[PDB]
Subunit: 461 residues, 4 copies
Amino acid sequence: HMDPVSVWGNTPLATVDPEIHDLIEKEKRRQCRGIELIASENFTSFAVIEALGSALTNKYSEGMPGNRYYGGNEYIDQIENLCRSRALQAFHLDAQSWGVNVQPYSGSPANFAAYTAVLNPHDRIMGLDLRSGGHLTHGYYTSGGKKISATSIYFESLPYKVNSTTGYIDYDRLEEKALDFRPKLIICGGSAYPRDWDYKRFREVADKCGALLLCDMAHTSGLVAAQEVNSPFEYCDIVTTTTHKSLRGPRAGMIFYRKGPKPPAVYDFEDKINFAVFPSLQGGPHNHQIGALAVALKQAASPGFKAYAKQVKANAVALGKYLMGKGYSLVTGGTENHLVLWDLRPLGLTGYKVEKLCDLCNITVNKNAVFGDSAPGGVRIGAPAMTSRGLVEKDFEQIGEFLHRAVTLTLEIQKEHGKLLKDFNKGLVNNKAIEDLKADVEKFSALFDMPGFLVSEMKYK
Amino acid sequence: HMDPVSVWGNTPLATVDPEIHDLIEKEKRRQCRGIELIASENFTSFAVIEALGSALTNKYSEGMPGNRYYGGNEYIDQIENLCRSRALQAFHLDAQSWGVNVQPYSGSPANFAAYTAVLNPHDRIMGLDLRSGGHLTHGYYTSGGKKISATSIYFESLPYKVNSTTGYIDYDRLEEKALDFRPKLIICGGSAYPRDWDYKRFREVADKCGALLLCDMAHTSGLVAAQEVNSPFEYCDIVTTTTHKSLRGPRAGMIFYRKGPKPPAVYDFEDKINFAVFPSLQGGPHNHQIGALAVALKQAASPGFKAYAKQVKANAVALGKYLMGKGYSLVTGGTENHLVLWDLRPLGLTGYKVEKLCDLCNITVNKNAVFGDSAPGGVRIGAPAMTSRGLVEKDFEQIGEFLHRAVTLTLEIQKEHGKLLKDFNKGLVNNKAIEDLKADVEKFSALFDMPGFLVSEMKYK
Amino acid sequence: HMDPVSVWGNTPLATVDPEIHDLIEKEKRRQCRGIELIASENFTSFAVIEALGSALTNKYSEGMPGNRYYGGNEYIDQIENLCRSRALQAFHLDAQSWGVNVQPYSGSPANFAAYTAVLNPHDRIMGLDLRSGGHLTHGYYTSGGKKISATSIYFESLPYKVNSTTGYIDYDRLEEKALDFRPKLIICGGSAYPRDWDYKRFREVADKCGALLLCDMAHTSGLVAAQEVNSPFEYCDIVTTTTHKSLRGPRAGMIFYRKGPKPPAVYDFEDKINFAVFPSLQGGPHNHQIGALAVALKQAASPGFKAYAKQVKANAVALGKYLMGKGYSLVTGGTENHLVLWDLRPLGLTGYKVEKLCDLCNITVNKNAVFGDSAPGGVRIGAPAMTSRGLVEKDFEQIGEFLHRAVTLTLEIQKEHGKLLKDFNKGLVNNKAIEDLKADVEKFSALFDMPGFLVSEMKYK
Amino acid sequence: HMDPVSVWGNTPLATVDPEIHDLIEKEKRRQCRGIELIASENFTSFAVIEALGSALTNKYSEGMPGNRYYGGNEYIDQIENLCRSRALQAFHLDAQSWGVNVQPYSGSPANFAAYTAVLNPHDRIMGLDLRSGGHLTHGYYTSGGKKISATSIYFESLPYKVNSTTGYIDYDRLEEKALDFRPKLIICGGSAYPRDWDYKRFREVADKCGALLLCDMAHTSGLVAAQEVNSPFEYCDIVTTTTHKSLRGPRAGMIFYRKGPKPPAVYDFEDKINFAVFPSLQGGPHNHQIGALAVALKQAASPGFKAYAKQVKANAVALGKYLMGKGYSLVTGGTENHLVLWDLRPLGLTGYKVEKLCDLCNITVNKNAVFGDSAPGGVRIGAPAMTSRGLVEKDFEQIGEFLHRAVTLTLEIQKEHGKLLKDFNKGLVNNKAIEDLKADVEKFSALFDMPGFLVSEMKYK
Ligand SMILES: Cc1ncc(COP(=O)(O)O)c(CNCC(=O)O)c1O
Ligand SMILES: Cc1ncc(COP(=O)(O)O)c(CNCC(=O)O)c1O
Ligand SMILES: Cc1ncc(COP(=O)(O)O)c(CNCC(=O)O)c1O
Ligand SMILES: Cc1ncc(COP(=O)(O)O)c(CNCC(=O)O)c1O
């Protein structure tokens, strides 16, 4: 006997799977009972979530709008076309000069799809070094030669670094490397770089060594959409990105590519990039993701989002100024985007130690490498998540006070117990000073609203 | 001025984005107002959709449960661990002998992650030929040498075909190729193969040529979970799959791998496959997909799903017997799984011609290559989608009657106008016989229930 | 104190290095005191040896004639231009349609230089299987996947085989493989194939799969120059060869390439092949080799050489007919070129066993694989070497009598001692029946003249 | 009718091929009627030439001594074994710690055979930049990305350069590159570097980045054998070389490799390198070259050669001091080996201009790139060739006087006519000052003896 559709197919989640429903409720509480400062995280809208969780997940639409393998894509084509036309207008792109593919399952697939389109296997790539604030998908191998990233497995990568004293990108060392290594593709953008990017200088370097210029604006896509940072579309041939970070959308990827006549002969990125996504690398697109993304791109083009992105920068600046006013060191001594990079080596601490104690106070940050590392000696702190909950400068200055108290309690424990990780941990068990900070954090966290779900109806406190 | 969280973050989709909401509603109507026979499609449960569209999309959990880069994954780890333990028990796998990774964004990423883990670039791969019913990600290049699939771009592929008269896999020609070509990996499983797979014979071939044996059970994962077809876990080293087809879950991928002591020395797939998914190829996992997948795997282990998979096989058989009783030819003359492959060359027709007229009657099938093609000459028809709506043998025999009438009207149009596409199309405009079939289809379609959403609350008719 | 030029630089070899001079004298005696039947060996002229051992070894002439890096190549250019113009006329090639590069250090470098010119790394190549009578540089890997040949290391190779019963090339199986594997280059020619090649059929196959057609005529270059076998220049794009085999020249290589307009648009092999030899792969050319080769190409274009090549075929035929008249089996039951392939499996023997006993009678042959091998079960016997010493059919029929007696004594030893290699060897020590054959061989060998050096002045008997 | 062996095989070269014999005679005159200063050239002994031009060219000996495919190698094995034992003692190598393979056809094949043995395709290599005085086979691609050298085609190369002001190897920039690029092999040695190599520093860099260390001592092999320069065997894992330069032997190659226990576990280079030479890359060895090489290695181990190598260094120093005493600039301001690198940019001249006028005075040098080039602006002048003819410091100081007059006439011509090549050439036609230098050169050249052949018996003046 088969179960009727009503029993298995229409019954709500809370009845079909109590375990998963209960676990999702605890995650919802965890997301609003603490302080989330992961620079790559955000809280998306309930409207995006509704499109994400819809019947759009049932449709196979292999191919592109108007050129699908299967029939019955009358509305999938309208949703995708709306999504890519919104993607272009959200970043103020003329359709005669720019095209976009909104089918990458995520940012990492978007980057590897861009590589396949414009490069052959073992072609040379240059990207920002991980320790300097770069990303894996830009190329990464260890000191022993172990090719960690797939970019360094199927292509030959070589990283350019920041100045080992100022923390800024060494554009003179970048040009020197690009002329020796002769990369076929140069990647700009990063995950923990607290300054803006000189895309015009990257263009001069790229032109000098005959390389294509790609920008991975994943972290700052929201700021780019609101024109709160430099636009890579003015100088790069290809722009890839995620959509779930500062853009505040679903987990997905996009690949922007130049179209039309080349500057002082027509660009031919469109077909290569479309073909790389499908049929080369990916199968059917996740239409529910594309529907949710179309919602996020319309929200990203609204005046409220421009104020949000402007607030994100002001909150990261206010947090950084508050930390430096307490004697703490920041890489480059400030920020021009959504995050600050906090150098903890001058304090005799490591990123892990501060990250672990902050997690025990429901303050979510991540240990991060700082220029001149040897054991990451810094923490990366981002503003988008809490800014999406309505926090402004005064609230972020209160976040700096919590971080101030967190590192102060981290030093007192290291002083009492030692600089040995094993010795350090012994000072966190039953520590009543942490529990008073955890409580001030939760109470401060619970004074703000939360997008995506209604707190009034959530199952846990 | 920033928009308050209530305005942008808590407002429902129907108000934030009327366009996308309206388009999703029409897709919902399209999904239940017609007859969906795409063998790779299904209608997932509302419980899966609720987990899919949740706050689980806000969390970055790069890494593995218990081995994450970031903190605050207390409940994400529980959701993922529950998902992998449910994946093992859904396929009756001993945890000491099998492991699974549930982070692949989709089926295509799962396969390429499996390749990266066990193979080096340019390693040789063998998979079922596309024209013989294989998949792109198993390897595909054109006759001009143009490497279409990424599997044939970063690896060296060579396809094995079916017997050009029986339509069955030529296992003697497979062994001959595997001994000449000496592949490092042999892939079994396909997208349009209507018979079961002799995994024991594939093991003999793999052992003879010293190759790893992988099975892509994407299409028949639901049947494998219910033990309605041969289990590849008894003879394959790695088993990859999608989760949104016969498994009736969300759009995602899984990679099963052997662990523990080797048969007549311990398997070492676990770390390679996990490392290939992250940090090599993918970034943060889509936790909402994993939550939705964990729900689907519990539904897949229920007695109702076991009856569903048995019904899928009975419906495809009943549909095939009905088509052969009307004089239509099927590849291999029947089916042992969820689909039938309908050879239309004996009728003087092409798959496209039949697919186009069926699309106008809201009958969704896909043109498909048939063994001995030179313009695909067949159509692939699947049972999972309509079977999930409660259709049984009698209903699928009525579906064959609709297909019978559809091809009968396709021959009458070709007879009157010709084999010229322009002339053929001319016979579909204002054709009243099609409108009588479409009307008979919709009315027949509207007599069944629908999973994922409640039809009583939908916006369109 | 430096040694004067007279002491170190002008003193003959017999005084400077007694060891090496004495060893060269013993090699000279070994070359004329026995019967040399290695199909790839020959005895070159004293004129070739004089040019080989000349002051031409002192000059660096990197580049091509008229486009050298260094000066002082006034006469090197004249020698090389004369060498390549003689190479074209020796093979009856119109200079408007064919070009040649005479700088490959040997045949193996010539083949790999041709590959580099027309192929990118990992491009697919097809060549005659080693066991079917092919060559390493055409591609070879073991059954375990060990890439033996550099052709299979830097390119992807796949061998085509002969019919496992007739011993002829399976052109239908060749076409089948070329259409599945889609090689970018197809290689014809071999080392132990006793029949001619259907180059027109190779052209049809190459055209069908869109591949370039190369012929490695190393073994039969002398027969091609005298037009005693099929000419590959009528159907192949590139022809590579050694010059020290049937061509009877020095150890070197040549690469012939098509020039001018393509048949029913102009060929562009010239610059790629010239560039691949230098500066890509090789350094300075061995001018002494090129001078010696120019001598050999003039000798190859003389009427005496055409009679020699015609005699080589007649001697190999007479030897084969004599062996088959004694009940011995030959692959394909005869020969159309310079060698016979003697299948010893019907006798219960292996090639090694016959080769070892023949070497003890100063009869030089080589064990060779025969179609359908599992321990090579055949011996390869060639005619050029002894034919260059003036032997005709009657003498080669006497060689068959010696081979007849050699295998008869090989069977008597296997009968008395056993089919175990260890047991077999025990029957060769102090065996007086071998010593009577060795003596008849030396006495028969010493009844003919020898090129390259004067036997009257040689140091040993 | 076949030609008897006496007619074609025993007739001397002067009768069989008058053209080639006449051209070889003119080359002999050219070699002794002028001044040869190509740093890569030398005049080998008549004993080497006699072994080079012998019956040793008739024998196929594929494999290794004692492990041959064919029989009848009793004396070829003795010649090769003597050659490898002489190679080891010529460079004072303990046979338990070092092995050598003497089958590379030339230096370029020796290097690529070493790469294949220890590296996989696309493995990273670092070598001295071509403009800084490196060699093609160490890696070379143009600024457009065009991979010129085969080393940069089948492997990924990156060159290290000299200091752009001192002209010395920048070992700090070498270590920086090796730690960024992470090469699997580092190559030391060059073609136009006038100083010695700090192999101990290369070992520190190699050990720091986990790379193998190879030295291409081709140019200075004679000086290494006489211990007149630093020995790379003390710090390198593999040492490759030519044998026809300062070693004063035939055109061939050798690959030295470490064996036995590793320094503070046993080296495994022996089998890989031997297998790479055969059967991977090369076919049958050129036994005549190995015989000639064995002769040269015995001459290289004689006290006369030790004095020769000491004289080569003294002559290059005396020539360099004479040029600097006339106000000419040398890279690094001197020399520690066999050559000087003459910077002509301070004179307003190019290397080509000086090379062309020197070629018209029968002074053979080569234009060469100098550190900081943008049209090579220097000339490379070597001492081995003329030193082998008995020239000492006083004679090389007279060579500098000729070079002084040559460049003085080059400036006088540039002054009168201009820096336009057409105008410059116009000053060399009927120029009586050049004819007075040519006459002074020939008469000076004809006052010295010549190795390889007896001048008393030569056909031309
Ligand atoms: C056998 C098989 N394996 C993997 C995949 C990849 O699934 P994704 O779309 O998630 O990449 C497919 C797609 N099947 C498409 C079809 O049969 O119509 C497939 O058929
Ligand atoms: C700059 C950048 N680009 C691409 C990606 C890939 O996104 P996916 O995880 O969806 O594949 C990331 C992930 N950034 C992760 C972090 O910084 O925390 C990223 O930081
Ligand atoms: C340092 C070095 N190594 C290897 C080679 C290769 O030698 P072959 O020509 O045998 O391939 C050369 C050529 N030296 C050329 C020159 O300096 O003029 C070389 O200079
Ligand atoms: C057909 C063929 N082509 C090329 C070569 C290479 O020649 P070199 O050894 O000079 O590299 C050989 C060697 N033939 C060896 C044999 O059959 O005995 C050959 O047989």
